[PDB]
Task: inverse folding
């Protein structure tokens, strides 16, 4: 139906869960904040497994390749998770680049990456060649913009040089504009860097991460997922909840992250339906009452 | 309503005689890099002798007024007054002074993403800068200019200051990019502003063309009748649009960024504000209507 941002408790919670085949969790702001996990999250995931409900995970974080992200889950207390369940914007970025750059031998090119080691590793694991890697540098056939702490005017210029070639793709991991840190400060997100590259190159970027449907496409290619029977749980309205709506799932805003209840209710009175969560909880831990 | 008809023969003589003076854009009109446009110096002289005032507008925020005056001289343009020169750096300094003169004796500093020339221009106006020697006052404004030292690090700082809602966000201009002599591009302030805006969740007050504030700077210094003034530039989305918004007559010259076909494309698309009244291959052609 049309989201009304109802608190998910009691019967509603029992219906919604029992109905669902599985849940898609965003990670940051939902399962953890920095190194401090959200109390109960580990327990919830376990009890979801006993109930026979599948779990998948999405993240616009392009800092950790899938292996290290799997280790992170492990180290933090989340047991029995497989790396195949993890879908980051980095992973999905690599997967798109492999889809768009497959070609006969002589068709291979390099990817110019504005981003960290984790992102590079993710691209290599998919079989992609990177510019700036040791050896002969093939013709750059793609520019990828991710979270780049080494972002510079020099490298922005370089990205644009590559993008002068209209046959060079422009991909971005996501459009998240900024992220909160532990000390209460913010860090610019790929969205702000993509904005710079797009503006400077006069180009539109193919975005893979939430709220782009492509991230969900990666997931449906790996697992049977019925959006009607899936819950999308996230902490950000403009990425997680909008994502859920575009994919046809039921959306649950959790309040342990970026967005607030009042922000959601503003979108509701404002009539921006696609930015309003069907339901909300204070923590994903609250979802355990329904098990 | 502009028809982008070539200005030649009789028309050229009429239009010039009609005008009080001409507003010249600099890059792409008077010069390209170190190579002046043949005839340009000669044109200015013949314009002054004919009793027509000449002013100059530029979205270039690299050079403070003194150095820009030297550039003109050194390149062959003699007898120019510094008051005739209006850059985005200049008007940015003038705006920040106008918006921060509030009655409280408690003044603050401006955090500048840009080169010495830009900082120099603000110091000339009496503004204090972050990163200057001494106590650093409360940052009361962030200014985005052409910043070759742009970094993720500095972007992050800018956003920290902008967390304070009473801190202004100003940008010199929104030019997305600029062509260089060798044929390469360099990102423009527009791309840098896009990053700051996106990451700060803020809109910037733009000072340069096609914002009318550039013209406001000019009218406070000189009596200018837009109806009798010629706006000559090489860029459609800044110079020509600026011209229309100010109510002047527009002349595209082809020695720079824009092409005749780009203008004619806007014409068919029905975007009148981006179509030049007249056009010439060079500003040199304007001498045919003089003596
Ligand atoms: C560098 C970087 N990139 C993306 C994100 C968003 C993570 P999520 O909430 O899981 O979508 C974060 C979250 O803090 C981040 O630090
Ligand atoms: C850093 C920078 N900023 C702005 C411009 C455009 C100047 P104009 O054509 O005089 O409006 C240029 C043109 O080269 C530039 O290099
Ligand atoms: Mg999140
Ligand atoms: Mg120009």
Result:
């Amino acid at each position: 139906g049309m989201a009304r941002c109802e608190r998910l408790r009691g019967a509603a919670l029992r219906d919604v869960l029992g109905q669902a085949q599985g849940v898609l969790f965003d990670c940051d702001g939902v399962l953890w904040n920095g190194e401090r996990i959200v109390p109960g999250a580990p327990e919830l995931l376990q009890r979801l497994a006993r109930a026979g409900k599948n779990t998948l995970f999405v993240s616009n974080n392009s800092r950790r390749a899938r292996p290290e992200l799997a280790l992170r889950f492990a180290r933090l207390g989340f047991a029995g998770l497989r790396a195949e369940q993890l879908f980051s914007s980095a992973l999905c970025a690599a997967r798109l680049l492999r889809q768009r750059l497959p070609g006969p031998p002589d068709a291979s090119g390099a990817v110019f990456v504005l981003g960290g080691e984790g992102l590079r590793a993710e691209l290599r694991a998919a079989g992609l060649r990177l510019a700036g890697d040791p050896g002969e540098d093939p013709r750059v056939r793609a520019v990828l913009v991710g979270y780049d702490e080494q972002f510079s005017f020099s490298r922005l210029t370089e990205a644009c040089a590559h993008l002068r070639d209209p046959d060079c793709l422009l991909v971005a991991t996501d459009r998240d504009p900024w992220h909160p840190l532990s000390d209460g400060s913010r860090t610019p997100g790929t969205g702000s860097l993509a904005a710079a590259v797009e503006t400077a190159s006069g180009r539109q970027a193919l975005v893979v991460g939430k709220p782009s449907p492509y991230m969900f496409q990666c997931i449906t290619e790996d697992f049977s997922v019925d959006p009607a029977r899936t819950l999308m749980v996230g902490d950000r309205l403009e990425t997680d909840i909008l994502f859920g709506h575009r994919c046809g799932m039921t959306t649950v805003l959790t309040l342990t992250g970026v967005s607030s209840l009042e922000e959601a209710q503003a979108y509701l009175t404002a009539g921006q339906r696609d930015l309003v969560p069907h339901y909300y909880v204070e923590s994903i831990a609250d979802l355990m009452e329904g098990l």
Observations:
- Chain B touches chain A at residues 147-152, 155-156, 159-160, 163, 176-177, 184-188, 190-192, 194-201 (CB under 8 Å).
- Residues 1-87+209-291 of chain B form a domain with the Rossmann fold fold (CATH 3.40.50.1000).
